[PDB]
Design a binder for these strands. Structure first.
Ligand SMILES: [Mg+2]
Lengths: 26, 60, 324
RNA sequence: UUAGGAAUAGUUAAUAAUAAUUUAUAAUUUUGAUUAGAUUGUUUUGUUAAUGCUAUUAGAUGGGUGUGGAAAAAUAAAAAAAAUAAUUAAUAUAU
C-alpha cells in the first residue's frame, strides 16, 4: 500500500517513453 | 481615457544646498509585463466551476 | 526524465503535425513525471485544442494552468475564445452531434476569457469577439439577448464583423422569431462592407415602431394608446373601440399559440435551421490552421473526388475525408 | 481482401415496455472484430493437359414533396400511353 506511488511513477515514465517513441531518432 | 502628463518634477539639491526641480519626460506603461516567468499572483482568473466534465468525484 | 527542451520540442511537433489527443497525452503524463509546464508548454497544447475545437479539453487545460500558477498571456486567451467557436455541434438526421456541449457552458468560458483579457491588461483581437458571439448562437444554443449586447459593444470598440458571424447570427434570430433584429443585421452588414452581404440590404419596416422592451415598460405603468402601443398599423388602418379591440387582441393571442403548438411531423422536433447542420472545423477535411477562419465549416466531399487523385486499386492519402 | 494483426460499442437479452425512468454475472473479437485502405457483386472473360492462374460494366442509394399501392421522381430511340393515329416492305435516324 505504500509502494504504489513509485510504481505509478514508473508506469507513467514508461508511458512517457512510449510517447517519446513518436520523436524517432535522437 | 486618461492622458499621460509627460513631464514630472524631481527635487535635486546642489553642493551648496540649493534645491530645485529636474523636469523629466516620463511616460507610463500600457501593456502588462507578462513575459517574465515569475508569477506575482495578482491577475484575474477565469471561473470554470460551472462546467460539467467527467469528474466522478465532483457533483453535476 | 530527459531534457526538458526535448520535452518541449516534441510538444512543438505534435501541435504542428498530428491531432489533439497527442498533446493531451504528452502534457498530462509529462506533468506527472515531473516536467514543469511553463506558459510555452500550455500555449502549444492550447493551440492544438483550439484547432480541433475541443471545448471540454480547453477547460481542463485552463484548470491545470491556474493550478500551476502560471499566468496566461494574450496569445493564451486567443486560443481559448477561438477554440470554443470551433466546437462540433449540429444535427445529423435525428442524431444530435456533441450533445454534451450543451451542459458545458462553453459560451460562458469564451465570455469569461474575454473578461479576463481586459482585466489583466491584454488587448483582445477582432476574431475573439466574433468567435465569442458564435458560441452563443450555434444551433444547439439560443442566446440572442447576450449576443446582441456583445455586438453592441463590438461596434463601440470599432470592430469589423466577420462574414461567418453574420451567417450564424442571422439564422439564430430567424429561428428565435426576431425579424427586426435580423433585418437590422442585414442592414448593418451591407453598410459596414461585410463580404457576401453587400447585396443584401433590407428596408426598415419598424422605423416608427419603438423597442419591444419599451412597450413592456410602458404597459406596467394616452391610456387608450398605451394598451395599443404594441399594435402595428399600416397607416390606412384604425383601431377599434377599447373594449372591442381588447377582445380582438385575445383572439390573436389564442390563435398564434394554437398554430405554434402543432408539431411538424417529419422534423424530429427541430427548426429548419437545425436540419442538416452538422458542423466540424476546417481541420476535418484536408486543411490546417488559418487565422481568418474562426469557425470554418468543413468543405464538402465534392471538393476532392476519389479516382482523380489516385488511379484504380491504388490508395489515396485521405483517410478521414468523406466520413462526416 | 490487406508485407510490418488489437481491442469495439446510441451498445445484448428479458419485459404487463406501441412511445423500455426497471432487471442482468449483457453483446462482438486472436476460429481475427471495429476503424483506415482497396472496393458493385457474378461456373458468363482469356489461357492451359489442368477442381490452377487471370478478368467483368445486372444492380441499389434513411432529410426534394408523407403524395402515392410502392419514392424509384428533376430526366431515358418506344415499354404506343384509356376512339384502329399508323401495323405493306427497307432506311426507322440525320432531316
Ligand atoms: Mg426487470
Amino acid at each position: 500500500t505504500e509502494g504504489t506511488q513509485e510504481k505509478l511513477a514508473a508506469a507513467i515514465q514508461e508511458h512517457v517513453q512510449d510517447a517519446y517513441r513518436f520523436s524517432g531518432p535522437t | 481615457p486618461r492622458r499621460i502628463p509627460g513631464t514630472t518634477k524631481v527635487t535635486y539639491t546642489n553642493k551648496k544646498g540649493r534645491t530645485f526641480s529636474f523636469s523629466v519626460p516620463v511616460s507610463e506603461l500600457t501593456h502588462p509585463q507578462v513575459t517574465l516567468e515569475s508569477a506575482a499572483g495578482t491577475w484575474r482568473e477565469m471561473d470554470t466551476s460551472f462546467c460539467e466534465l467527467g469528474d466522478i468525484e465532483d457533483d453535476m | 526524465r530527459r531534457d526538458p527542451t526535448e520535452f518541449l520540442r516534441v510538444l512543438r511537433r505534435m501541435s504542428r503535425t498530428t491531432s489533439w489527443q497527442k498533446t493531451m497525452l504528452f502534457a498530462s503524463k509529462g506533468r506527472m513525471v515531473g516536467y514543469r509546464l511553463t506558459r510555452e508548454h500550455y500555449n502549444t497544447v492550447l493551440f492544438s485544442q483550439s484547432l480541433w475545437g475541443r471545448a471540454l479539453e480547453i477547460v481542463r487545460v485552463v484548470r491545470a494552468m491556474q493550478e500551476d500558477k502560471v499566468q496566461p498571456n494574450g496569445a493564451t486567451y486567443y486560443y481559448i475564445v477561438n477554440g470554443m467557436g470551433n466546437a462540433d455541434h449540429g444535427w445529423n438526421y435525428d442524431f444530435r452531434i456533441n450533445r454534451r456541449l450543451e451542459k458545458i457552458q462553453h459560451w460562458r468560458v469564451a465570455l469569461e476569457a474575454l473578461e479576463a483579457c481586459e482585466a489583466n491588461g491584454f488587448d483582445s483581437t477582432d476574431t475573439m469577439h466574433n468567435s465569442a458571439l458564435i458560441t452563443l448562437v450555434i444551433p444547439g444554443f439560443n442566446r440572442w439577448q447576450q449576443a446582441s449586447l456583445l455586438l453592441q459593444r463590438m461596434l463601440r470598440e470599432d470592430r469589423r464583423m466577420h462574414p461567418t458571424m453574420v451567417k450564424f447570427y442571422h439564422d439564430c434570430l430567424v429561428r428565435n422569431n426576431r425579424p427586426r433584429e435580423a433585418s437590422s443585421l442585414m442592414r448593418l452588414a451591407a453598410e459596414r462592407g461585410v463580404h457576401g452581404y453587400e447585396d443584401k440590404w433590407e428596408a426598415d419596416v419598424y422605423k416608427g415602431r419603438p423597442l419591444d422592451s419599451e412597450v413592456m415598460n410602458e404597459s406596467e405603468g394616452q391610456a387608450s394608446s398605451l394598451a395599443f402601443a404594441s399594435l402595428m398599423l399600416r397607416g390606412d388602418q384604425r383601431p377599434l373601440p377599447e373594449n372591442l379591440q381588447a377582445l380582438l387582441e385575445e383572439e390573436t393571442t389564442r390563435n398564434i399559440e394554437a398554430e405554434r403548438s402543432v408539431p411538424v411531423p417529419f422534423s424530429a422536433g427541430l427548426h429548419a435551421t437545425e436540419i442538416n447542420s452538422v458542423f466540424r472545423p476546417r481541420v476535418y477535411r484536408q486543411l490546417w490552421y488559418k487565422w481568418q477562419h474562426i469557425a470554418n465549416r468543413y468543405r464538402p466531399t465534392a471538393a476532392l473526388k476519389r479516382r482523380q487523385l489516385a488511379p484504380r486499386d491504388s490508395p489515396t492519402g485521405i483517410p478521414g475525408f468523406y466520413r462526416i
